[PDB]
């Protein structure tokens, strides 16, 4: 979960990592700590800034084993392997110990400082650019986290996007939505795993996805109703993929009741006109769920519902043909 430069420096400040007031410097360094299965890896380089892009063999890295944090001594001898010498090596080693304390104690996934600048005259260090990724699931044990996470690697979270994330943290289930600029095929798929395979299916045959959307962990009807509406609103809509694998515990009779109402409310607003809905689903109460979604052809929609016998992502082929 990426966090903005503002909150990142508040956390740096808390752990004594030198930050500019929010300056004229002599040199730029590269410092980063990226978490791994065994703890985290600390990356140091004397060639920071724009200059790191080419000087990758100049980087010295030590693996910090989980809860086995190195001594100020070990870090300062790593600093010396990076090309540092004397006080530069000393204060840099100290910064790293404060960076490890921040990483370990702030449930961080990664911290990247480029440039970490030095004003040699008074040995004033400053973290100029701070790229922090924390594990926001751990928010429950960080009362000082007066911030929300931003988009990992993507544009800022839109109007309908923010609304899906808001209603997500109200129920015990899960509802996710990402807007893809343009695209014909609007996915309304169950489970993260199946959603990704449906998107891959569209891209693979040449198609263009209107969005990314998932609903899992037996979400209450309205949450699925709210996700359905959002997906129907989408530009250039002509195909809706109401997919999913065979659910283990999600009541398909219950979720489909939400989807049916999210479809009725959208077509009444003048959205689902000439839009072919493709349903393929399995799981608890699939018989009732699939029968009730079939019924939307009696009054309204151009719906084509299938059971488990229809391979999962093969509704994408049928949609993209006719």
């Amino acid at each position: 979960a990426k966090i903005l430069e503002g909150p990142a420096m508040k956390l740096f400040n808390k752990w004594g990592i030198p930050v500019p007031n929010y300056l004229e410097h002599d040199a730029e360094f590269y410092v980063s700590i990226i978490g791994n299965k065994d703890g985290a890896e600390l990356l140091i380089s004397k060639h920071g800034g724009v200059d790191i892009e080419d000087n990758w063999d100049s980087v010295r890295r030590i693996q910090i084993e989980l809860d086995e944090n190195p001594t100020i001594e070990q870090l300062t001898e790593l600093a010396k392997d990076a090309g540092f010498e004397g006080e530069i090596a000393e204060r840099v080693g100290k910064i790293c110990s404060r960076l490890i304390l921040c990483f370990d104690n702030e449930d961080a996934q990664s911290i990247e400082i480029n440039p970490l600048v030095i004003r040699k005259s008074d040995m004033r260090f400053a973290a100029l650019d701070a790229v922090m990724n924390v594990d926001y699931d751990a928010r429950f044990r960080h009362a000082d986290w007066d911030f929300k996470p931003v988009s990992e690697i993507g544009r800022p979270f839109t109007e309908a996007e923010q609304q899906i994330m808001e209603i997500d943290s109200r129920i015990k289930g899960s509802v996710k939505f990402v807007e893809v600029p343009g695209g014909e095929i609007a996915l309304l798929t169950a489970g993260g795993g199946a959603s990704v395979f449906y998107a891959d299916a569209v891209v693979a045959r040449g198609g263009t996805i209107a969005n990314y959307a998932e609903y899992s962990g037996d979400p209450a009807d309205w949450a699925v109703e709210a996700l359905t509406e959002t997906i129907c609103r989408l530009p250039n809509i002509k195909h809706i993929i109401v997919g999913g694998a065979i659910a283990n515990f999600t009541d398909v009779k219950a979720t489909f009741s939400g989807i049916i109402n999210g479809f009725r409310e959208s077509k009444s607003k003048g959205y689902l006109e000439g839009v072919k809905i493709w349903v393929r689903r399995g799981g608890p109460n699939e018989a009732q769920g699939l029968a009730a979604i079939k019924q939307l052809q009696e009054e309204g929609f151009d719906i084509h519902v299938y059971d488990r016998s229809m391979p999962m992502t093969d509704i994408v082929d049928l949609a993209m043909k006719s």
Binding site: G191, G192, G193, A245, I246, N248, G282, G283, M312
Partner: peptide
Amino acid sequence: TKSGGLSNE
């Protein structure tokens, strides 16, 4: 599988 729904599929 990593995914729960996909182990059933």
